[PDB]
From Swiss-Prot:
The keyword Acetylation does not apply. GO terms for biological process: proteolysis. Residues 7-279 form the Peptidase S8 domain. The keyword Protein transport does not apply. It comes from Parengyodontium album. Disulfide bonds join 34-123, 178-249. This is Proteinase K. Its cofactor is Ca(2+). Its EC number is 3.4.21.64. One of its GO terms (cellular component) is extracellular region. The chain holds residues 106 to 384 of 384 of the full protein. Binds 2 calcium ions per subunit. The active site is at residues 39, 69, 224. GO terms for molecular function: metal ion binding; serine-type endopeptidase activity.
Length: 279
């Protein structure tokens, strides 16, 4: 399948080269997979989600996304226009308040929630969790992310936006999950992206158009935007039967575009998420 005039990041994930604008993907499109977006919530009523999104948990007075961040990330995973995996099921877990903040204790509870809640859902092709969040190093946050992964969920986490080594941030620094840096449309490391040996992969993160609250759209930047490209890619590849939740990060690294990015510090992988879709 071909989506013309796609957001640059979608086109990038299905291309060996920068500078194109059509997204190519197998029409299965992540059908039968599930992606949990652990964030500020998801505006499930947005036409872009087509009834495929729902809120399943909140730790606050409402499950509504009063911020937009979670809606944007969910859109990159699975919206019809802005998403990688256009037929996946999206589940919102609101661990971040409407200012975009959340206590680590709440974030940990949300990860444990997903590990259990997947057993309440129909995800025959597998389960992914996208975590566009983090703060300073915490062994307890990392352990929660490790448990979620161990339980059979493909965990994708943002590297962080500090232009620093991700070893000092969580859950970015948990080795067993998929830690995602950000690139731009010219194949440069995004100016803010964290780096380091713990990164597994890069995805598009500068100037990413997606859904927003109030039934709207906007372009924003961050490792938060790169992460859902990888989460959606994992769901897509799992639906195709090419990989599993436990092995998808490694498979994505195996099949990535190699050596295409500039300003990658010595010791950081030069790997850009790629669907290898061949019609
Ligand atoms: Ca290339
Ligand atoms: Ca890893």
């Amino acid at each position: 399948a071909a989506q013309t005039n796609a957001p640059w990041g979608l086109a990038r994930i299905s291309s060996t080269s920068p500078g194109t604008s059509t997204y190519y993907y197998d029409e299965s499109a992540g059908q039968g997979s599930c992606v949990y977006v652990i964030d500020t919530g998801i505006e499930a009523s947005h036409p872009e989600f087509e009834g495929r999104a729902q809120m399943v948990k909140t730790y606050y007075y409402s499950s509504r996304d009063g911020n937009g961040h979670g809606t944007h990330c969910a859109g990159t995973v699975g919206s019809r226009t802005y998403g990688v995996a256009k037929k996946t099921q999206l589940f919102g877990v609101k661990v971040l308040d409407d200012n975009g903040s959340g206590q680590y204790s709440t974030i940990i509870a949300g990860m444990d929630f997903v590990a259990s809640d997947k057993n309440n859902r129909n995800c025959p092709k597998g389960v992914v969790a996208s975590l566009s969040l983090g703060g300073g190093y915490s062994s307890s946050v990392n352990s929660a992310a490790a448990r979620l992964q161990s339980s059979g969920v493909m965990v994708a986490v943002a590297a962080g936006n500090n232009n620093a080594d991700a070893r000092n941030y969580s859950p970015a620094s948990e080795p067993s999950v998929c830690t995602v840096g950000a690139s731009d449309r010219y194949d440069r490391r995004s100016s803010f992206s964290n780096y380091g040996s713990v990164l597994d992969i890069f995805g598009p993160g500068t100037d990413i158009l997606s859904t927003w609250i109030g039934g709207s759209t906007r372009s924003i930047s961050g490792t938060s935007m790169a992460t859902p490209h990888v989460a959606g890619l994992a769901a897509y590849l799992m639906t195709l039967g090419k990989t599993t939740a436990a092995s998808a990060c490694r498979y994505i690294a195996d099949t990535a575009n190699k050596g295409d990015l500039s300003n990658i510090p010595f010791g950081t992988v030069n790997l850009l998420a790629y669907n290898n879709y061949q019609a």
